[model samples]
Target: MENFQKVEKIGEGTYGVVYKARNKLTGEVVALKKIAIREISLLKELNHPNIVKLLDVIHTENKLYLVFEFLHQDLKKFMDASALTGIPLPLIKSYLFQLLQGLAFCHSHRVLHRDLKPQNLLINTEGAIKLADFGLARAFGVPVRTYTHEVVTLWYRAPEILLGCKYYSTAVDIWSLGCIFAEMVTRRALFPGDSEIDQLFRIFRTLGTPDEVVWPGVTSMPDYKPSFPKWARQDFSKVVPPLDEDGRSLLSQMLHYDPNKRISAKAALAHPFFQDVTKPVPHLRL
Candidate 1:
C-alpha cells in the first residue's frame, strides 16, 4: 500500500481492497492489499504456494499495505464462468489435487489456513489454483493453549471446531478441503449450516457422531456436547453424491474424525489423484 503506485481496484479480498499495481523498481504487476496494521506480523511469517505470496509490507502514516503476486480470478469467478453445474470430472480432480498440495505444504510448516473457501483460491489464466488470503492464518501447535474458535468460514468449518475446541489443529484445514472437494464435484457446498450447533449436526449427520473411542479426548473437549441420532457410520455415497470410489476414498482420508490419524499433506500428494501430473510441484524460488 505504500511503495507501489495505486492502480485500479482489481477485486475485493477477505480482509481488504485489492488493487492492481506495479513494483516501483521491478515494474512487475502486483497486487497491493491495504489492510489494518494489526495484520502485518501474521503476513510477514506466512509463505506457501497455494497461499498468496506476501512480497512486501509497508506502512504510510496510519495505514498498512501488503504486496502480493497478481493473479487473474478466484475459484468463485472461475466456477461462475465455467458453470459449476457440471464441471468436467478431470478438471475438478485437477483443481482438488492442486488445492490439497497447497494445503499440505501449509500444514507441513504448521500454519493453519483458518479461512479456506472458493473465494480465497486464485486461478491463474492457465487454470492453476493458488491459495490466497492469510489474514486469518496462525501458527498452530502451541501445546495446551487456547485460541479463538472464531476461525474459518461457516460453510467450511469442522465439527470439533464448531464445538468450541480450543486445541484444534490442522484437521480444521482438511475439513475445509473436504468441503471444497465436494463443492468442486457437485457445484454446491456439502454443508451450508446456519449456526454452530447446526454446523456440527450437519457434519455428524453426514460423517456420523464422534464418540470418545473414535476421537480420544472427545468427551474432554472444551465444548463437548451430545449429538442426536446417537452414532451412525458415514455413507460416503449419500454424502458426496456422485464422486467415484477414488474421489470418495481421498475425501474420507482427509476428513477422518481423528485429527491424529488424518492424512498428512505430503502423504496426500502421493495419492493417485496426482499420479499423472506432468510437471513436478513448483519449489518456492524465494
Candidate 2:
C-alpha cells in the first residue's frame, strides 16, 4: 500500500475502493485493490474468453493488491444507458451467450460464482461480456456441501437460497443469469426487492409460490411455511413482453424453482433463442 502514491480514487465498484495509483519507483500508473484468498487461486484457474483476465497480484506483509484488466463499463450501466428501449435483441443474445459461456466453464471446473449480477458483469470497448468480481465465489466438491445461503444480490438470488437451503450449487448462478436476461430486455431489475424476505416474496409473486409439487423439497426448506400466500405463476411473455417465445422459453428454464430442474449454463448456450444471433457489433453504447 505504501509503495504506490494515490493519483485519484476510481469509483468504489462491486468489491471495494479502487485507485488509479502511481508506482513510487517507476512513475507508472495502475488500477489497485482487494480480494479473498480463494478468489486469487480460483481466478488463476478460471481463464476463459468470457471471464475477466487477472493481470497481476501484489502483496506486502500487511496488504494485498490485485490488478485486473481494465474494462470501461458493467452491464448495469450499459442497460441503464438504453433504459428507454432496452438492449437490442441481438446484443442481449450475444451478452447472455457470453455469460453462459463463462459460467459453463466455471461449473465444469467445480467453481461456483455464488454472486452473479449485472453489476459484476463487465463490458469492454469490444462489447465482450466478461465475468468479474469473484469475491464470493468458491469451489464446490463432488457431492455438493453446505455453503452459506447468503451470497448473490437480492434481486438475482435463487429461490432455494432465499428459502435458506445451504446445499446448493451452480443453479444459484443460473438463477441470477435468468434475472440478468430479463433485465437486459426490460432495462430494469426483474425482481427488485428491499430485503431478503421481500425478495423471496417478489419471486413468489412473480413466479408463483412454490410447493412440494413445484419444488420437491420445498416444504422442508428452513424458511418454507404453509401460511405464506400462494400466488399462481405469471406468464413470462407477459412480464417481459419484448422477448420472443424462444427467449422466454430459455428464461423459464433458467428460473425453475428446483435447482436440479434449472437449466445449466452449458445447455443454455445451445438453446434455440441464440441460434440466429450473429457476431455482436462492438462498442454499442446504446
Candidate 3:
C-alpha cells in the first residue's frame, strides 16, 4: 500500500472493494483488487490482449491486494450511457468480436470465465474491450470441477449452469456472451429474471420449453424444473430489431438452449454477424 497512491474507490468485487490507484514509483495507474486466493492464481496464468493485466499483488495480515493495469471504464456503465444514443451497431460487432476472441483464448487455455457480464468487461475510450474479473473464473480439466451451479449473474447464466449442471463446458460462457450481445443491442437485459425459477421460465419462454426432441434428457438435468410451464420460442426480432438477419441468426445460435449445441466462442468469432468487422474493408456492415 505504501508504494501505491489510492485515487478513488472503483467498485466491489466478489471478494472485496476495488480501488483505482497510481504507482508512486512510475506513476502508472492501476486497479487494486481485494481477493482471497484462487483469483490470483488464475490471473497470473492468464495473459492476453483481451484480458486484464495483473501487475502485482500484496498480502496483508488481514487482506490480500491484487494490482491490475487500470482500464478506463466497464461495459455496463458504457452501455447504461448508450441508452439514449444506442451503442454503435458496428461498435457492437467490434466489441463482441473482442469478447469472443478473448473467450476463445480462455477456452483454449482450459480456463472458463464463469462470470462474464457487462460489468466484468472493461472498456476504454478507444473502444478497446478486455475481459476482467477472474474471481469467479476457474481453470477446468480434471475428473471434474467441484463448482456449483450458481456462478454468473442471474441474467446471464446458461440454462445448463443454472440447472446445477456441474460438468458444463465453455458453452456456459457462450450463453453469457449471448445475453450480453443482446443487452448491448437492446440496452436492457434479455432475460431479467428475479429468481432461478423465473430465469428458467424466461429462457424457456424465449426458446420454447425443451423436450427430449429439443434438448434430449433435459428433464434429467440435476436442477431441471420438471414442473415449469411450456412456452414457444418468442420472435427474437422483437428483442433486437436493429440487428440484421445475420446478426439475429448468430444471436440465436449463441442463445441456443442446449449447452452442447451453443456455438463455440471461436466459431462465434467467425460468424457472419461479424463479417463487417472481419472483412478486408471492415466497414461494409456499417
Candidate 4:
C-alpha cells in the first residue's frame, strides 16, 4: 500500500471494491483490487494479450490487495453509452474478436470463465478489451466434475445451468459469449430474464424449446419437466437484425441446444464471420 497511491474508486469486483491507482515510484497507473485468493491463483497461471494483467500482489493483516494494469471502464458502461449513438460494426467485430482470443487462450489452458458478462470485461480508450474478474473462473480438465449451478449471472446463464445441470463443460462460457455478443450488437441484453426459470424460458422462447430430439439427456436434468412449454425457433436474422449471415451463423453455433455441439472458442475464431477481421484494430474514438 505504501508503494501505490490510490487515485480514485473504480468499481466493485466479484469479491470486493477496485480502485484506480498509481505507482509511487514510476507513476505508472494500475488497478488495486481488494480481497481474495482463488482469483490470484488462476490469474497467475493465465497470461494473454486479451486477459487483464495482474501486476503485483500484497497482503495485510486484515485485507489482501491485487495490483493490476488499469483500464478506464468495462463493456457494460461502454455499451451503455453506445446505446444512444450505437456501436460501429467493425468495432463490434473487433471487440468480439479480442474476446474470443482471450477465451480461446483460457479454454486452451483448461480454465473456464464461468462468469462471462459485460461487467467482467474491461475496456480502454484505445478499443482494447480484456477479460477480468476471474473470481468465479475455474480450471477444469477432460473428466469434468459437478460444479455449483449458481455461477453465471441470470441474464447470461446457460440453459443447462438454469435447468440445474451441474456437470457442465467449457461450453457454458460459449453460451455466455453468445449473450454478450448479442448485447454488443443490440446494445441491450439479449435475454433479460427476471429469475432462473424465467431465464431458461427466455432462452427457450428465443431459440425454441429443447426436446429429447434436439438435446439428448435433457430430460434427465434436475429441473427438466415434460410440462415445460414448447416454443418455435425464431430467425436469427430477425432477432439480431444487425448481424450479417456469417455472424448470425456463428451466434447460432454458440447458442446451440446441446453443450457438446456448441462451438469452441478456438473454432469460433476461424469462423467465416471473422474471416474479414484479422487484427483487432480500434474502430471508435472511445
Clashes of each: 1, 0, 0, 0
Please tell me which model should have the higher lDDT, number 1 or number 2: 2
Model 1: how far residue 251 lies from native, Å: 0.6
Candidate 3 residue pairs in backbone clash? none
lDDT of each: 0.71, 0.77, 0.78, 0.80
**How well does model 2 score by local distance difference test?**
0.77
Which residues of candidate 4, in runs, are more than 4 Å off?
A: 36-39, 135-152, 278-286
Local accuracy of candidate 3 as per-residue lDDT tens digits, 16-112: 6789898899888889976535556656777888899877768878667888889878888777777888787878888888888889988887778
**What does candidate 2's lDDT look like per residue over 106-130, in tens digits?**
8888777777777778887776889
State the local distance difference test value for candidate 4.
Answer: 0.80
Model 1 residue pairs with clashes: 50-131
Candidate 4: residue 165 lDDT (0-100): 84
Model 3 gets an lDDT of 0.78
Tens digits of per-residue lDDT for model 4, 1-286: 7888898988755556788888888899989987535555657767798998888768777667888888777888768777887777888888889989888988887777776788889887766899986533442221122232224357887888888888778898899999989888877789998777888889889999998988999998999989999999999988898788998999999999899999999999899888777444443453
In model 2, residue pairs whose N, Cα or C atoms come closer than 3 Å (at least 3 residues apart or on different chains), thus clashing, are none
- Candidates in order, TM-scores: namely 0.82, 0.87, 0.88, 0.89
